[PDB]
Write a protein that binds this DNA or RNA. Structure first.
Ligand code: GFF
Ligand code: CL
Ligand code: CL
Ligand code: CL
Ligand code: CL
Ligand code: MG
Ligand code: NA
Ligand code: NA
Ligand code: NA
Length: 326
DNA sequence: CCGACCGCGCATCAGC
DNA sequence: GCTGATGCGC
DNA sequence: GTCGG
């Protein structure tokens, strides 16, 4: 929060480009700037000072001067005054409603929460759940609750099969004192890059968690990726906990490190690392790290036995989870 | 300049 | 039914 | 919107 004013501005600008302009590269350009500045250990005094940092160009330097000088940005002031922009930005806050759907709904006259509610018929399954838990999904999850949730998930998983290994990643693994959701990496010895000796591996876990009333809804579900809703159990007479978003990813056992790396994030950290990888002649995905042949085509997976091996391949000093929050 | 911007699972759709 | 592109999200 | 070659 040392430069909280500036970073909030950039993020607001990032959201505008993504949601309203549908300019994904401008979106990421603003995010990178916000990130590098959030990490800057000095209270910024000028755009020029800011331009020294990588990711901050001329355009953003100018905006920072305006912000430092007036405490606001006219460009944003107008965006906030624009009804269409405001409506699209809001609608995209519903899980399942993206830039396209948001703009389309506004085109039909659906611009508010009230509107969405009386038009459920026009929403797909995911969007319907996103609306239902609109309020809840906006709430943060205290680490204390993340710990209780972890306990439930690991123990329930263990009940299904002692050989499953469930790892909580995302901001939680990065040591965050609060998280936006719960991210679970799952592995079973019967599922490897070599073969799938047992079907319904993810299903079983999902089913067990639904049985105990932990998982309450499903946004989407496939063979290796579950995306849904969960809720901690409340005691007698106490208000129940808010519903939380939960993602579960089943990854081949032998590809755990690339998997835990990917799911630990952050998303921006992953983008930076994968980009750096390319520059170093490698391509990284949640399964493997492969070299780039002279042609520019990925080669065979390289041997990995720790998160650090991945960092070594691209000549990056290892960075603990707590330091990957970009 | 100007091309590149990480990589991929699931839901949905049009076209065959 | 299938494949492929697109939307959305992680 | 920003970067490198
Ligand atoms: N290669 C990519 N990896 C991505 C991307 N988005 C998410 N991820 C990865 C890294 C997250 O930690 C992880 C979980 O995705 P999530 O959105 O939950 O992020 P995080 O948990 O880090 C969080 F934003 F901090 P939260 O508010 O939930 O506490 O998924 C992406 O665009 N590319
Ligand atoms: Cl763009
Ligand atoms: Cl402003
Ligand atoms: Cl691996
Ligand atoms: Cl791969
Ligand atoms: Mg998360
Ligand atoms: Na710069
Ligand atoms: Na959304
Ligand atoms: Na998540």
């Amino acid at each position: 929060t040392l430069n909280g004013g500036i970073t909030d501005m950039l993020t607001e600008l990032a959201n505008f480009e993504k949601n309203v302009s549908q300019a994904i590269h401008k979106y990421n350009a603003y995010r990178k700037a916000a990130s590098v500045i959030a990490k800057y250990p000095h209270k910024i005094k000028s755009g020029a000072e800011a331009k020294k940092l990588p990711g901050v160009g001329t355009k953003i330097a100018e905006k920072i001067d305006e912000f430092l000088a007036t405490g606001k940005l006219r460009k944003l002031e107008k965006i906030r005054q624009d009804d269409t922009s405001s409506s699209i930005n809001f609608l995209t806050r519903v899980s399942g409603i993206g830039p396209s759907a948001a703009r389309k709904f506004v085109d039909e006259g659906i611009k508010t929460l009230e509107d969405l509610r009386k038009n459920e018929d026009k929403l797909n399954h995911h969007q319907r759940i996103g609306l239902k838990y609109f309020g809840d999904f906006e709430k943060r999850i205290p680490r204390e609750e993340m710990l209780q949730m972890q306990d439930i998930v690991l123990n329930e998983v263990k009940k299904v099969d002692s050989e499953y290994i469930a790892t909580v990643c995302g901001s939680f693994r990065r040591g965050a004192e609060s998280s936006g959701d719960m991210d679970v990496l799952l592995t079973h010895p019967s599922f490897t890059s070599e073969s799938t000796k047992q079907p319904k591996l993810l299903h079983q876990v999902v089913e067990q968690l639904q049985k105990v009333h932990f998982i309450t809804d499903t946004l989407s579900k496939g063979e290796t990726k579950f995306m849904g809703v969960c809720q901690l159990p409340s005691k007698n007479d106490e208000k129940e906990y808010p519903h939380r978003r939960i993602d579960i990813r089943l990854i081949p056992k032998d590809q755990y490190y690339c998997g835990v790396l990917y799911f630990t994030g952050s998303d921006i950290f992953n983008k930076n690392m994968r980009a750096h990888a390319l520059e170093k002649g490698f391509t990284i995905n949640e399964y493997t790290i492969r070299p780039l042949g002279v042609t520019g085509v990925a080669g065979e997976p390289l041997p990995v036995d720790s998160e650090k091996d991945i960092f070594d391949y691209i000549q990056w000093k290892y960075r603990e989870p707590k330091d990957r929050s970009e």
